[PDB]
Amino acid sequence: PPIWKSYLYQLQQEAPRPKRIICPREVENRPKYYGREFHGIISREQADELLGGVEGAYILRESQRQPGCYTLALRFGNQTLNYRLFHDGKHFVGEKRFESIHDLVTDGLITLYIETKAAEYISKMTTNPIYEHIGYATLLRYEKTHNFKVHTFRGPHWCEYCANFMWGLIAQGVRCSDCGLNVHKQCSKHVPNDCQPDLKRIKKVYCCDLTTLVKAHNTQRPMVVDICIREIEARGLKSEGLYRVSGFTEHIEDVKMAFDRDGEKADISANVYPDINIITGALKLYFRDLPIPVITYDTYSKFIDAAKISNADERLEAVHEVLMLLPPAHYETLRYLMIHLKKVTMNEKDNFMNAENLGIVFGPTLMRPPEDSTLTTLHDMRYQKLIVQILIENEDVLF
Ligand SMILES: [Zn+2]
Numbered sequence: 001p002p003i004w005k006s007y008l009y010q011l012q013q014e015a016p017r018p019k020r021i022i023c024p025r026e027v028e029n030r031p032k033y034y035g036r037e038f039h040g041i042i043s044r045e046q047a048d049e050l051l052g053g054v055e056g057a058y059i060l061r062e063s064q065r066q067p068g069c070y071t072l073a074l075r076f077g078n079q080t081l082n083y084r085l086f087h088d089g090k091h092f093v094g095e096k097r098f099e100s101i102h103d104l105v106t107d108g109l110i111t112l113y114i115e116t117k118a119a120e121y122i123s124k125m126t127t128n129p130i131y132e133h134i135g136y137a138t139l140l141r142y143e144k145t146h147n148f149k150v151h152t153f154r155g156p157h158w159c160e161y162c163a164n165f166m167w168g169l170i171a172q173g174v175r176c177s178d179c180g181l182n183v184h185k186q187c188s189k190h191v192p193n194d195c196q197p198d199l200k201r202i203k204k205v206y207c208c209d210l211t212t213l214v215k216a217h218n219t220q221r222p223m224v225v226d227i228c229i230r231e232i233e234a235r236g237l238k239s240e241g242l243y244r245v246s247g248f249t250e251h252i253e254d255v256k257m258a259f260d261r262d263g264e265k266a267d268i269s270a271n272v273y274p275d276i277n278i279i280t281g282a283l284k285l286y287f288r289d290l291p292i293p294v295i296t297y298d299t300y301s302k303f304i305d306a307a308k309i310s311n312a313d314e315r316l317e318a319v320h321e322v323l324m325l326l327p328p329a330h331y332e333t334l335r336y337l338m339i340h341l342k343k344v345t346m347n348e349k350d351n352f353m354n355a356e357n358l359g360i361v362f363g364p365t366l367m368r369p370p371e372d373s374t375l376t377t378l379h380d381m382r383y384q385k386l387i388v389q390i391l392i393e394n395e396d397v398l399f
C-alpha cells in the first residue's frame, strides 16, 4: 500500500454535483438580491416538487412566516434537506464556510456524500497515525507551537498526519503559517508541537500530485523524472540489471531529499551518488511517492480489461483507447518514461533488462488498485506488469 491512502479522494469523485440551479419561470420576485435559483416564497410541498428525485438538485426560498429568512433546499437521495442560509458579505450555510453559492452546494454535497459513506473511517483517521515517519520530521539536517491556519488547497492535497485525502472544494484543512505544514482541521488538534519554521524554505517536489506539480512548475513532465533519466542515460545505460537492482535505500532518500529544495531543479550528478542504482531507485521512488499513480486509479480497471484480450492485435488498440483517457500530466510522464526506459530494452546485451523484464519492476509502481475489493486484486497484479511491458514494447506506436 501507498503512504497516501486514496479512499476519500476516490469518494469525492463519486460525489453528486449541484444537479440543478433549477431556475423559476423568471418570476423576478422583488424581495431578493442575489440569485435566479431563488423561487421567492413557497411551500415545502411545492419546493420538493420542483426538485423531485434528482439527487443533487437544489433550490432557494423565503419563509412564508418570518421575513428575511431564506433557506437552501437540496436533494440528497435519501431525502430533501433544508439548510437555512446567511450572507456575511458572502453566501454561507453552517460551518464557518463562506463561499459564493453553488461552490456551497458543491462542497456541501461533497461533505454529504463522504460523511455519509464511512464516517466511522473518517473518525479512526486519528488512530494509528503516520505523521511520525513521513519526512524531514524523520530526516533532514525542543517544543514550539503551530500557528495553524485554515487554507484552501488548489490541487489535491493530503494530510501530512493521517496521510489521508483533504476533501472539499475550499474547506480543505489547515496549513501552518510558520512551518509550512498541511493537514486536516481535526488532526491539527492531535499533531504534536515540534515544528521547525525554517523547514518551510523547502518546497517538497517528491509526494505532491503529478498534475499539480507540473502545472505549478510550468513543465508538462516532473522535473525530477527529467533530471533523473538525463543522468541514468548519461551514465549507466549499459549497467547490469538497470531498475531491477536496488541501491542503498538510505542513499536514495538522500537524493529525494535533494530534489526537495536543497537544489530542487538543481540537484546532482554521477559522483556524489556513484552507484546509479541509487538514481534509478530515486526515480522509482518518485513514482512510488505520487498521491495518484502515473496510471491513475480511474484508469487502472480499464487498463486491465485490455491486457485480457489474448489477441495481441486488439490488446494494443485497446491499450491505446484507454491510454488516451489519461490526464495530460500522467500521459506525458508515462510517454517519456517509456523510452528513456524502452531505450534500455535496446541494450539487454549489456544490462539484461527487457520489456517483460522491466514490465515487472514497474508494473507494481506505475499502477495501483483502488482497493477495498481485494480478492481478484491479486489475480490482476500479473496484468499490471504486462501492461507496462506492453507499453515499453510497442512504445513508438502509442506515443
Ligand atoms: Zn489527516
Ligand SMILES: [Zn+2]
Residues within 6 Å of the ligand: 145, 146, 147, 176, 177, 178, 179, 180, 181, 195, 196, 197
Ligand atoms: Zn509549524
